[PDB]
């Protein structure tokens with residue numbers, strides 16, 4: 541439970557405007573004009589975007605603006621660009637030398653057309669087999685929207701366990717990638733004629749196969 | 754050239770202690786009030802503590818008061834946080850953050866580090882095994898080839914991966930980790946390269962797992 545309340549998510553299309561709200565009370569957002577907003581890309585240091593409700597640091601583009609009405613502050617991004625996809629956190633002085641924050645809003649930039657996945661399937665390495673383990677690695681790339689399911693087969697039989705699949709996340713080129721792993725014993729790997737990884741994306745499937753031989 | 758870099762994040766047992774560091778450069782450190790702010794996984798930011806330029810004005814959030822101690826050494830351009838009596842809910846990325854110039858930027862963190870991950874758990878540290886994902890005549894899309902590294906069975910997060918020491922970035926994607934039922938993580942990284950380069954260029958994935966003091970430089974060959 542964050543001290544300030546923000547919608548978990550917001551979205552818009554390139555060139556559009558999006559507004560993100562931040563609800564506090566009179567002990568913080570409504571008690572002072574010390575409201576700040578920070579931008580955070582994944583794995584990066586947060587960056588100051590807005591301070592004292594509506595002021596912009598040098599170097600923040602003018603399409604970011606801030607306002608507040610009573611106990612609620614708002615960040616508006618005009619002319620949305622793909623790079624604005626990020627998490628945004630509001631903040632306020634709260635008295636008693638305290639600074640409080642919101643829970644974050646993930647801003648998604650939409651309008652991307654459909655893109656089909658590519659699938660790359662790797663067999664276990666010699667080194668892993670010598671460690672008495674075997675992991676097949678199925679890498680799925682370059683797709684949009686970011687939703688897939690992954691099915692594994694031993695020969696033609698759907699596997700009964702040992703699968704771990706990641707949630708899709710963005711590539712550098714703004715399409716999605718995901719990964720899936722099939723854990724086997726070396727004996728299982730060597731005793732079937734082939735294994736397959738099949739990805740389902742928007743009603744279509746791509747399947748790759750590998751063989752120990 | 755304002756720079757902040759945190760260090761010291763690690764696995765620590767419930768009830769244990771840990772000490773974080775932050776090195777600053779590119780500004781007049783001994784005139785700034787410095788802060789620790791944290792972000793629990795999937796949660797929002799949480800300010801923890803501030804220390805003035807002379808270390809004589811110190812404030813703590815309720816959530817850490819009596820457990821964490823902030824301090825600084827202006828001669829080393831460094832800030833510290835001594836964490837005691839740690840609990841699972843103290844698991845978070847810990848950020849060093851500069852308060853802006855007083856009067857102009859009151860209650861604003863105008864510069865931040867990238868943060869260091871602290872994991873509070875009774876589990877044990879485990880370094881990764883790194884396996885090659887070799888390109889083959891069934892891993893090629895004609896003029897380009899995909900190759901990768903599998904980073905198996907480590908704990909806690911995080912692992913970092915680069916290719917050829919950062920000289921290769923265009924064809925690179927490093928995937929998020931899976932958490933397996935063993936309680937251990939695995940991840941993979943992949944890069945696309947010219948098929949013709951497979952005979953001439955060496956491809957190396959550089960894997961770092963700081964909690965286990967492990968560095969692996971794994972050659973990925975055909």
Ligand SMILES: Nc1ncnc2c1ncn2[C@@H]1O[C@H](COP(=O)(O)OP(=O)(O)OP(=O)(O)O)[C@@H](O)[C@H]1O
Pocket residue numbers: 784785786803804805806807810852853854855856858859860861
């Ligand atoms: N951006 C800021 N926002 C909120 N409080 C701040 C900020 N910058 C400094 N402070 C606070 O201002 C107070 C003064 O700290 P400072 O480091 O200026 O020591 P000082 O001895 O008063 O300074 P001086 O040597 O200039 O007289 C401390 O309470 C500190 O927490």
